[PDB]
Ligand SMILES: Nc1ncnc2c1ncn2[C@@H]1O[C@H](COP(=O)(O)OP(=O)(O)OP(=O)(O)O)[C@@H](O)[C@H]1O
Ligand SMILES: Nc1ncnc2c1ncn2[C@@H]1O[C@H](COP(=O)(O)OP(=O)(O)O)[C@@H](O)[C@H]1O
């Protein structure tokens with residue numbers, strides 16, 4: 001139904017599906033379904049439901065073996081959600097989590113883009129103790145030399 | 153019956169132990185528990201504590217009368233003009 | 249002459265190593281000499297903080313003194329209820345210390361009971377999840393809708409069917425410390441003491457131990473008796489949701505209930521567990537006979553045929569007595585061919601049970 | 609005398625129980641003989 | 657010849673002087689020991705190498721240093737003789753049993769066969785299979801993968817024969833039977849029971 005342009009109908013159809021109920025369902029499959037629900041809700045811009053689904057998914061799965069793609073997609077969707085919301089500090093934290101992934105770390109352009117986003121969003125964040133802490137942490141990074149303008 | 157009932161916890165039981173030991177030291181001693189209703193009541197717990205200490209002394213007397221560690225040649229005399237209040241364990245025909 | 253010099257050098261090396269061992273011994277001896285000059289310190293409890301430099305401390309088995317802190321100590325660490333080490337002469341608080349009792353029967357930790365051990369409670373397990381996982385996993389959804397979390401969830405049903413097993417399973421699923429109530433340090437309604445028992449109920453759980461509670465005498469309080477019920481209602485009525493005293497009760501019978509508890513917040517959920525299903529009993533046999541060394545083919549449906557009106561604990565001692573008669577007849581194995589006769593003899597007045605006997 | 613420690617049968621040591629006061633590890637005075645002080649019996653101890 | 661005489665005299669002098677230091681320190685330790693030792697139970701050992709001591713005088717003290725014994729060779733509940741004044745652990749003590757506890761052991765080994773019990777064969781069989789089978793068979797339980805019960809409760813009206821079956825089990829076993837009673841585990845002195 002999404003491929004036919006019925007994004008709202010597809011999101012509504014996928015929303016009623018409660019992944020947590022199906023215990024026998026594989027954890028990676030469950031998280032993939034959760035991320036699909038996230039994507040559909042963001043496509044239909046139901047940000048409250050997206051936040052609820054974000055509360056549904058746990059943050060300890062992304063530190064596993066083959067969860068790199070799931071981690072990247074989930075953090076991209078969370079970045080989109082907080083981009084609509086405007087919480088720049090949460091966006092910076094999500095981008096930092098993206099940058100710490102080994103897959104992005106390996107590829108040059110991907111980690112460079114992740115660091116660019118991290119520094120730009122920590123710049124966008126309002127001044128506070130946590131923002132200053134994050135600025136100190138990000139500034140004390142050696143890879144910033146690969147992005148001279150961003151380091152300056 | 154006023155000395156098996158002591159102020160401190162477990163002193164009546166020790167009193168019974170030492171009494172039975174002294175009886176065993178003598179050859180074929182006789183013991184007469186006059187007015188056994190005093191320390192021969194019925195065990196209970198619905199009273200939220202009850203006597204406990206008196207019940208413990210009675211239980212130790214029960215143990216000395218019959219059970220492990222055979223009592224020996226100690227014939228026991230017990231008298232009471234109200235026997236229906238005695239513990240069935242004490243009234244059991246292995247002790248009396 | 250090189251070999252003789254090497255031999256004397258080796259003996260010299262041995263003697264030097266012996267001297268190093270003597271060095272270690274002498275340093276230990278000097279250390280114990282230094283330890284001798286030390287003097288023990290009384291252990292005390294800080295009842296109250298008087299001023300920035302005055303404390304009231306009672307010895308463990310002695311009187312209470314007004315004393316002062318030594319100097320280089322954190323007065324924040326010295327709170328009413330902390331164990332400290334008074335100097336034995338000046339009584340000054342030299343240092344603080346980390347802290348049987350009635351709580352010796354309070355804990356009843358869940359253990360490592362998981363979902364796999366419990367068999368044939370799929371709908372019941374889903375009910376427990378839908379009732380409890382939201383207060384644990386997502387307490388914020390209640391704020392989103394704007395309602396106090398549900399506290400009283402009654403998993404009423406026959407005892408020995410796995411109520412606490414279900415609770416331990418979900419607890420291990422969330423790895424939350426399941427503090428099942430063993431009365432002591434948690435008795436509240438018990439009319440012997442009024443408010444000290446309330447204090448123990450509250451402080452021992454929730455505050456010290458995070459959450460996840462239960463209760464013993466599963467059908468006692470669910471069913472002076474009127475005043476006992478009013479005091480129970482006062483104990484359970486409604487408490488702060490910051491601290492969890494979730495009363496997951498599992499009373500054994502339905503008639504042991506009164507309308508005074510049916511109000512939500514008091515007892516909202518009514519999770520019902522019935523007599524175990526034949527397939528559910530089958531799964532319980534499977535999991536419980538897992539551990540027993542069962543060589544050969546086991547046709548558990550035959551033993552299911554005569555397992556009607558049982559509970560989980562019945563099935564557990566079925567497996568235990570399978571092992572028992574395997575010992576009695578010297579069989580490392582246990583087959584269904586005698587499972588049949590055992591289930592033939594596990595139903596009488598006291599459910600027969602142990603008389604099932606023949607089972608390997 | 610609660611127990612005979614008997615470290616080497618030359619410095620034997622003796623664990624005694626002073627009714628309710630305490631329990632102690634003491635040695636006999638030279639007046640009495642070790643064979644005369646058996647385990648479990650009651651004895652008089654100096655106060656110092 | 658240089659190495660042999662030089663280093664021989666060197667290590668000999670160092671060893672002799674250091675052994676003299678050993679002897680003097682040890683002699684001072686023993687003269688510090690003296691008597692008596694106030695016996696105490698180590699409630700726990702904390703790091704900071706330090707121990708909490710419960711003396712037989714029903715007094716709990718703290719010890720920043722544990723004294724002349726080894727912390728590794730110590731555990732909660734240990735019996736240690738400490739100084740009466742400084743309350744410092746002077747010696748470790750072997751486990752000690754009270755005189756009543758020592759007399760609690762069955763040595764007469766009464767003579768009551770299982771045949772003396774009448775009308776109780778189910779109960780006798782259960783007690784044998786739950787108290788004697790786990791005793792003299794052991795590994796057979798492990799091979800089958802079941803756990804024998806730890807304890808047995810025998811309850812009933814007086815005169816049914818509970819104490820008789822206990823005496824028969826003591827008679828018909830080679831185990832170390834330890835008779836006792838509920839009342840005797842009650843003492844006025846706190847903590848004695
Ligand atoms: N079933 C029995 N068969 C044979 N003798 C029995 C039986 N029951 C009791 N007796 C006899 O009863 C006498 C005393 O009973 P015993 O104290 O041994 O039993 P009990 O039930 O343990 O008693 P209590 O509950 O009073 O401690 C003994 O001499 C014993 O031989
Ligand atoms: N679904 C099940 N799977 C395996 N064993 C079970 C199951 N249900 C019950 N049992 C067994 O039965 C007993 C259940 O006792 P339980 O219901 O916890 O009693 P209570 O709830 O009164 O404490 C346990 O010993 C357990 O081994």
Ligand SMILES: [Mg+2]
Pocket residue numbers: 219815817818819820
């Ligand atoms: Mg008896």
